[model samples]
Structure formats: structure tokens, C-alpha cells
Target: MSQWKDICKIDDILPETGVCALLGDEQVAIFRPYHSDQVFAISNIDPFFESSVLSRGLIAEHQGELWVASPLKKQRFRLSDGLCMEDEQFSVKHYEARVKDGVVQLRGGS
Candidate 1:
């Protein structure tokens, strides 16, 4: 198990958007859905572009599952499970995230 560290306050990240943060040495992208308090964290790097820009992508729902479409190529990745919608072999890494006392925290470590 990994320890959770406070990355930012809940209000720091706007809903339906994301922000990049560091958990230990891992680059994490924290996302909050529109009209919801639930937060999702994943690696900032997009496997397709090999770039750390997922945090700037658009967040949406496909078939009831939350996903982030990369801005570079518009590749979609499942926010909950980190599964790439277009390719099964490529996927972004997912991290555990939660909110406590208006602060958002993410877990790091393998």
C-alpha cells in the first residue's frame, strides 16, 4: 500500500478539468468531474504521445464511464481504470485519489 499525500485543496482544481502534480517521483494528473465532488488521479503522461499533457485534456463520459481525451491526438482513456478506448495495449497509469476536509490527496508508490 502507498501513502496518500495532500497535493492541493479541492478548490484548487476546477471541476471537469485537471491539474498536474507530483507524488513522490511519479507525475500524476488529478481530475474532477463536472458537477461532482469525486476526483480521479492518473499519470500525466499520455502513452500515445509520450507527453505529460493529459492534465490539460477534456474530461467527458462515454457509456457512463468517465474518460479523458488527450488534447494531442484526442485519444480517450478511462479515468477510473486507465484503459485506453482506442487501443487495448496502451493505457495510462491510474492512482488512488480522494478528498478529505476540502483537500485532495493522491497515493504514490508501486
Candidate 2:
């Protein structure tokens, strides 16, 4: 059975940005896109640089989808699926996230 882990309050994250959360043993990067009800969760680590720095990446739109560009290599990772736009082989871990009663929660494990 899967359980939702508390990440943070909806107000804690601003629009068009992301924050890193420690969900149990996994480091989850929770993003609040420019639009409403569009929270996304992915691994905080940058696959190319191997650093926990995805949360500090810049949020932007690409091909009608939301993506975050890594600060180190500028590799854009899809917010919905954690797909690396530059390389398909270097996809990060994606998690199920939602906002319930003004709180951001994440589901599943890494």
C-alpha cells in the first residue's frame, strides 16, 4: 500500500519555483508551476552533475509543458515525467504529488 508523505504547505512554495523536501529517505523536489493545481515532484538530484540541486533550477515552459533547467548543466527536466529534454537516457525519478487542504503531499517511494 502506498502512503502520502507530507512535504510542505501550499503557501510555502511560490509560483514558478520549486523547493526541496526530505520525504523520509528520499530527497524530493516539489515544484509549483505558474498555473494552479500544477504541483510536481521529482528527484532533487541532477543526473548529469550528480548533485542535489534540482530545486534551485529555473522553471520554464517548453513545448507547452513545464520544465526546470538544472543550474549546473542547464539540462531541462520535465516536471510531469522527469524526462531530461537534452538526453532521454538521463531521466530523473518522478513522484506523485498533490495539494490537499493547503498542504503539499507526495506519494510513492524512490
Candidate 3:
């Protein structure tokens, strides 16, 4: 169990894009969408693309839900739940993320 692993400084994550990190044997992505103060964490692997690259994706909103669009295959995944909007079966993974004392932290991944 992870006990708040320091990913980076809170300001390190761009409000528009995201940042990726490797925790143990897992690849995780951290994001701070525009017009929002909350931070989110999810697996960097794209189920549809089968590639470990989500931090490079775009953060966007669809209808009334906030999602991150895959840069490769153009699939939107929910930032909170990591559910693929196009296909539920292809949902990604979500992890525990937070900001403490102006620092970004993640706790998940095996």
C-alpha cells in the first residue's frame, strides 16, 4: 500500500495538459484540468490504443462529463472513473491522487 508517494510539486502539473510518472511497476498520469482545482490520477495505458501514453492526451469535456481524449486513437476516458466513453469495456484505471502542502501525490498501482 502506498502512503502518499510524492509525484511532483503541485505547480509542476500544467493546468491544461498532464504529467506522467512511474510508480513501482505502474505507469500513472496526473492531471489538473482547466477551470478546476481538483487533481486526478489514472493509468497511463489506453485500452483501445493498447499503448501506455495518456499523459500526452488532451483534457476535455463531453456533454456534461469531464474526459481526457486519447491522442492516438481519439477515445475519451472519464477522469474520475477512468471509464471509456466510447466503450465501457475499454475503461482505463483510476488511482488516488491529492495535493498536500503544495505537492502532488498518488497512491495506487499494485
TM-score, model 1 to reference: 0.88
- TM for candidate 2 is 0.89
- Which structure among the candidates has the greatest lDDT? 2
Span of ten consecutive residues with least summed lDDT in model 2: 45-54
Off by over 4 Å in 2: none
The segments of candidate 1 whose C-alpha lies over 4 angstroms from its true place after superposition are none
TM-score for each predicted model, relative to the true structure: 0.88, 0.89, 0.86
Model 2 root-mean-square deviation: 1.6
Total clashes in model 2, counting residue pairs 3 or more apart in sequence or in different chains: 0
Lowest lDDT block of 10, candidate 1: 45-54
Residue pairs with backbone atoms closer than 3 Å in model 3 (clashes): none
* Candidate models: Cα lDDT each: 0.81, 0.82, 0.78
lDDT of 2 by residue, 1-110 (tens): 66798777888899888999887878888988765767998888765668677888898898998888877777888987888787677577888898998898998753
Q: In candidate 1, list every pair of residues with a backbone clash.
A: none
lDDT of 1 by residue, 4-108 (tens): 899888888876888999987788988887646798888888655686667878887889998888777868878886887875586668888889888888886
The segments of candidate 3 whose C-alpha lies over 4 angstroms from its true place after superposition are none
- Number of the candidate with higher lDDT, 1 or 2: 2
